[PDB]
Design a protein around this ligand. Structure first.
Ligand SMILES: NCCNC(=O)N1CCC[C@H](C(=O)Nc2ccc(Cl)c(F)c2)C1
Ligand SMILES: *[C@@H]1O[C@H](CO)[C@@H](O)[C@H](O)[C@H]1NC(C)=O
Ligand SMILES: *[C@@H]1O[C@H](CO)[C@@H](O)[C@H](O)[C@H]1NC(C)=O
Ligand SMILES: *[C@@H]1O[C@H](CO)[C@@H](O)[C@H](O)[C@H]1NC(C)=O
Ligand SMILES: *[C@@H]1O[C@H](CO)[C@@H](O)[C@H](O)[C@H]1NC(C)=O
Ligand SMILES: *[C@@H]1O[C@H](CO)[C@@H](O)[C@H](O)[C@H]1NC(C)=O
Ligand SMILES: *[C@@H]1O[C@H](CO)[C@@H](O)[C@H](O)[C@H]1NC(C)=O
Ligand SMILES: *[C@@H]1O[C@H](CO)[C@@H](O)[C@H](O)[C@H]1NC(C)=O
Ligand SMILES: *[C@@H]1O[C@H](CO)[C@@H](O)[C@H](O)[C@H]1NC(C)=O
Ligand SMILES: *[C@@H]1O[C@H](CO)[C@@H](O)[C@H](O)[C@H]1NC(C)=O
Ligand SMILES: *[C@@H]1O[C@H](CO)[C@@H](O)[C@H](O)[C@H]1NC(C)=O
Length: 340
């Protein structure tokens, strides 16, 4: 086998149920084929292959699909786009993301990096060959990566360029921390409950590894100062409702009487600034009854402060906004090649 680096158009696969009215299922039913009934991963003996997750067309290809999925699935009362106005009907929908596999057409194959502490760029010593990735959930998230994969060994610090502060940092956790968000039976007041013990343990480890990457320096956490509500809050979609949660308690540099349950204040918003960058959208009020989503915190989005080269500290705040990094967090060990 001999290959070369190449971009090409991918296709998708799913376990989607054709009887479901859930929108991820309805979209995967007509845009994707069924998942590979006999998937086989094959090792590449004595092969070293270098990867670059910040340099992967797979990401932008998935991004186009999630844009597609949201525009056909989400029914907004009125669509406020670039100097435009549209008025429609906005019934409530069934919303729950399902895993999606990304697969190469003929002449192309996917290379899988299996080195347990691969950071996302550079040489991979344990390389695989697959026809499709594994099932990736398209979770649209800010500040915190939800329902993803875990790093198998240590916590991984991923970044295209650690010395550039504009570059986003992806923290790949090795132990998931549960986030339990509930709007109980304001109709827009909600809260997310987190294990403080579990949470502070893991964030202590996150700081000890950023210490390794930044020359033993003091690692400070801080809430985002300024930006849109989707940036300064942990924003996610639970069962169709847009949750905005205040995470200041999570990035508490201190509980590093504070090892119980952390309860984050949340509000469901009807008017959101779309992650697709095209403007404002207005949706309908929340459904009646108890609205609950439990998810796994599996990764953290961070931006580092600048102007601290002559200081003794480094400051990191929760990031968000560019959903590409969310897909990048799960496609990092994949790249497409052209077989020669
Ligand atoms: N480093 C990139 C700067 N990002 C940026 O400029 N954006 C434009 C304005 C806010 C946009 C957004 O994140 N929207 C959103 C909507 C719903 C959910 Cl659930 C969610 F998690 C997020 C992103
Ligand atoms: C390579 O990765 C595989 C799959 O993750 C795993 O069995 C092990 O870590 C590695 N195996 C060899 C033979 O290097
Ligand atoms: C990732 O590993 C490569 C070596 O392959 C190194 O050059 C790069 O600085 C590392 N990046 C991070 C963020 O650790
Ligand atoms: C949450 O994480 C555990 C392991 O940490 C895993 O077994 C479980 O399936 C995860 N749940 C979801 C919804 O991903
Ligand atoms: C997670 O990684 C840290 C180092 O980053 C390590 O100390 C810890 O033991 C790991 N935890 C698990 C459950 O692997
Ligand atoms: C990373 O960013 C720093 C500061 O922005 C810059 O000086 C450096 O050349 C960049 N390195 C690479 C490899 O792009
Ligand atoms: C999530 O929280 C609600 C109320 O806060 C509680 O009733 C439920 O048992 C919790 N679920 C889990 C899995 O912790
Ligand atoms: C937090 O996790 C610990 C283990 O780290 C566990 O014993 C305990 O049940 C959890 N506490 C809460 C309040 O969820
Ligand atoms: C960083 O601190 C650790 C503390 O365990 C020490 O072992 C290491 O030599 C230090 N390295 C640098 C570059 O300061
Ligand atoms: C989050 O809560 C703190 C107090 O707990 C408050 O000062 C801060 O303004 C809140 N964040 C936002 C974005 O409103
Ligand atoms: C994460 O997965 C669980 C189980 O599938 C689900 O209940 C929860 O709503 C998911 N979280 C998000 C943010 O989609």
């Amino acid at each position: 086998p001999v290959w070369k680096d190449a971009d090409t158009t991918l296709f998708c696969a799913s376990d989607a149920k054709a009887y479901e009215t859930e929108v991820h299922n309805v979209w995967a039913t007509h845009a994707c084929v069924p998942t590979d009934p006999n998937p086989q991963e094959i090792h590449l003996e004595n092969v070293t292959e270098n990867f670059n997750m910040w340099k992967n067309n797979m990401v932008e290809q998935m991004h186009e699909d999630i844009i597609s999925l949201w525009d056909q699935s989400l029914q907004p009362c009125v669509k406020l786009t670039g100097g435009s106005v549209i008025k429609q009907a906005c019934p409530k929908i069934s919303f729950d993301p399902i895993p999606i596999h990304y697969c190469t057409p003929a002449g192309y194959v996917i290379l899988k990096c299996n080195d347990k502490n691969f950071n996302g760029t550079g040489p991979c010593k344990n390389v695989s060959s697959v026809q499709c990735t594994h099932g990736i959930k398209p979770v649209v998230s800010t500040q915190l990566l939800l329902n993803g994969s875990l790093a198998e060994e240590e916590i991984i610090i991923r970044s295209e360029n650690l010395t550039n502060n504009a570059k986003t940092i992806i923290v790949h956790l090795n132990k998931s921390v549960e986030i339990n968000c509930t709007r109980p039976s304001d109709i827009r007041k909600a809260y997310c409950e987190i294990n403080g013990t579990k949470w502070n343990k893991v964030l202590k480890q996150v700081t000890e590894k950023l210490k390794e990457h930044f020359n033993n320096k003091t690692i400070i956490f801080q809430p985002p100062s300024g930006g849109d509500l989707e940036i300064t809050m942990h924003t996610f979609n639970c069962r169709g409702e847009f949750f905005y949660c205040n995470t200041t308690q999570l990035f508490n540099n201190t509980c590093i009487g504070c090892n119980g349950t952390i309860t984050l204040p949340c509000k469901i918003k009807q008017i959101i600034n779309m992650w697709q960058g095209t403007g404002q959208a207005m949706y309908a009020p929340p459904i009646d009854g108890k609205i609950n989503c439990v998810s796994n915190i599996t990764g953290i989005l961070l931006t580092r402060d600048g102007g601290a080269n002559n200081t003794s500290n480094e400051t990191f705040r929760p990031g968000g906004g560019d959903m590409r990094d969310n897909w990048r967090s799960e496609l990092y060990k994949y790249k497409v090649v052209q077989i020669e």
